[PDB]
Design an enzyme around this catalytic site. Structure first.
Site, PDB file in Angstrom:
ATOM      1  N   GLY A  31       1.845   2.778  10.910  1.00  0.00           N
ATOM      2  CA  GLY A  31       2.741   3.915  10.800  1.00  0.00           C
ATOM      3  C   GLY A  31       3.455   4.332  12.069  1.00  0.00           C
ATOM      4  N   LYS A  90       0.054   4.182  -0.397  1.00  0.00           N
ATOM      5  CA  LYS A  90      -0.649   5.347   0.118  1.00  0.00           C
ATOM      6  C   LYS A  90      -0.453   6.517  -0.856  1.00  0.00           C
ATOM      7  CE  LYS A  90      -0.530   3.446   4.726  1.00  0.00           C
ATOM      8  NZ  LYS A  90      -0.446   3.676   6.173  1.00  0.00           N
ATOM      9  N   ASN A 136       0.868  -1.183   0.000  1.00  0.00           N
ATOM     10  CA  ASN A 136       0.000   0.000   0.000  1.00  0.00           C
ATOM     11  C   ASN A 136       0.902   1.228   0.000  1.00  0.00           C
ATOM     12  OD1 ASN A 136      -1.869   1.984   0.287  1.00  0.00           O
ATOM     13  ND2 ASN A 136      -2.501   1.381   2.383  1.00  0.00           N
ATOM     14  N   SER A 151       3.092  -1.686  10.598  1.00  0.00           N
ATOM     15  CA  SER A 151       4.517  -1.685  10.886  1.00  0.00           C
ATOM     16  C   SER A 151       5.241  -2.973  10.525  1.00  0.00           C
ATOM     17  CB  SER A 151       4.812  -1.268  12.339  1.00  0.00           C
ATOM     18  OG  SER A 151       4.310   0.053  12.595  1.00  0.00           O
ATOM     19  N   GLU A 157      -5.398  -4.931  10.627  1.00  0.00           N
ATOM     20  CA  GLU A 157      -4.391  -3.900  10.908  1.00  0.00           C
ATOM     21  C   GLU A 157      -4.820  -3.197  12.196  1.00  0.00           C
ATOM     22  OE1 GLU A 157      -4.320  -1.742   7.009  1.00  0.00           O
ATOM     23  OE2 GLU A 157      -2.379  -2.724   7.028  1.00  0.00           O
ATOM     24  N   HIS A 191      -9.716   0.767   4.458  1.00  0.00           N
ATOM     25  CA  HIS A 191      -8.497   1.060   5.194  1.00  0.00           C
ATOM     26  C   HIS A 191      -8.807   2.019   6.339  1.00  0.00           C
ATOM     27  CE1 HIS A 191      -4.510   2.522   6.063  1.00  0.00           C
ATOM     28  NE2 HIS A 191      -4.113   1.357   5.571  1.00  0.00           N
ATOM     29  N   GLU A 210      -7.326   4.618   7.379  1.00  0.00           N
ATOM     30  CA  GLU A 210      -7.252   6.029   7.087  1.00  0.00           C
ATOM     31  C   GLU A 210      -8.552   6.543   6.482  1.00  0.00           C
ATOM     32  OE1 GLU A 210      -2.519   5.367   6.818  1.00  0.00           O
ATOM     33  OE2 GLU A 210      -3.579   5.770   4.908  1.00  0.00           O
TER      34      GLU A 210
END
Lengths: 249, 249
Positions: free
Chosen positions: A172, A12, A10, A212, A166, A94, A96
């Site tokens: 992150g 991003k 990904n 991560s 996740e 996701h 985000e």
């Protein structure tokens, strides 16, 4: 035996033409000698470049999001548009997008259902927040997120589904889940799928971990029996994605 | 004398490779003999195709949206990414994004300011709703939307700004504003710009109308003294976009 693993990048909202050409060449030159589905998800505007340059036979290209239908949705990209341009994988739900861009369980579930109807492979993302984990709500949360998706799917649609667990607190942050943390959740998810969807579905379902993942932590995660690969953010912009792929051997 | 007109095609979330190749060929074969900036805004995934195929010298390519900065924004496309791939126009604050996708006046203003800093030409969209118009709030609304943008811009940034006045009730509805309706709003906007920004800025500023523009209504709209062209949705997917361009003669 585990099903075919997946190693998914990904990217991003990152990349230049030059950086992508270089990274793709690194990925192309890395010769992969085991059965694994590699996935690269670039930004929408970079999909044609990646389609032109990526040649490693183990890879497919994914979108990072989509909406279900074409029409008067300025700024958005639909599932039919992606299918027509040759993209038949999509990441949906996701964190985000759940957090910044309004995607509730219902919105995610609806998107996943539409994508399956349109013939996509879907990487459907689930995961609890730091606060939810501290409250001992992890299982309820991930099962509720999964059940919302499931309620809009026929049994046969699950052949097109990949789950990506996740934990939000691992995305992150420099704080990967331990193998034991991740395995506990993957085991619970697979049990729910087995009991609600079917034993055959559960045995074939890929449940990926993300948050991560890096080249040094990936193999010990993959050694756990219910982890089928990875959804990789930061490390997937780097040459070490090669080692993450190789950690699925 | 009016400044250079603009004829802008907002394709929204529409297109296939085949339909775009055909339409672009129509646009390429239409020889334009006056000074006009034509703009095509395809979906992000179609930008490379349009860049490859569109050759008419009067055209530039725009994005339909962007976010200001690259990073951990799964699904989004940033201004640096667009600039790197050769897109230096962007539509910001379209009503569909203000209404469906959370874009408040502040969010729009911030995006416009960032885009100007990054060297974009910006088509910044403003406009009142049906209810606002019935309440006699049109002027307050469009001036508030414009002032929010202005508060984040230096004077010199206005050389990069184009305003698009699109009454929300005219978008996609088969109910174009009359020339007199549109001119009244463009006159008020230009007066605000003249008084708040400068007389020089106001004389050079393109203020476009959008909302149900078509080949048959465009010329009489363009005849009004404060209308500098068009932001076109549905008709821009059709050959009649040629006639809308020619209506800016």
């Amino acid at each position: 035996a585990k099903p075919q693993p997946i190693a998914a990048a990904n990217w991003k909202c990152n990349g230049t033409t030059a950086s992508i050409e270089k990274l793709v060449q690194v990925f192309n030159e890395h010769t992969i000698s085991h059965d694994v589905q590699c996935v690269v998800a670039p930004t929408f505007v970079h999909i044609p470049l990646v389609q032109a340059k990526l040649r490693n036979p183990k890879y497919v290209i994914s979108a990072q999001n989509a909406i279900a239908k074409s029409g008067a949705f300025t700024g958005e990209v639909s599932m039919p548009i992606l299918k027509d341009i040759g993209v038949h994988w999509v990441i949906l739900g996701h964190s985000e997008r759940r957090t910044y861009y309004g995607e509730t369980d219902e919105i995610v579930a609806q998107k996943v259902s539409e994508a399956c109807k349109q013939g996509f492979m879907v990487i459907a993302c689930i995961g609890e927040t730091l606060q939810q984990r501290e409250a001992n709500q992890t299982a309820k949360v991930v099962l509720s997120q999964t059940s919302a998706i499931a309620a809009k799917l026929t049994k046969d649609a699950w052949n097109q589904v990949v789950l990506a667990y996740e934990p939000v607190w691992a995305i992150g942050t420099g704080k990967v889940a331990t193998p034991e943390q991740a395995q506990e959740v993957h085991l619970l998810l697979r049990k729910w799928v087995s009991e609600n969807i079917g034993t055959d579905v559960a045995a074939k379902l890929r449940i990926l971990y993300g948050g991560s993942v890096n080249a040094a932590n990936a193999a010990t995660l993959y050694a756990k029996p219910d982890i089928n690969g990875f959804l990789v953010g930061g490390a997937s912009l780097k040459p070490e994605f090669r080692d993450i792929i190789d950690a699925t051997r």
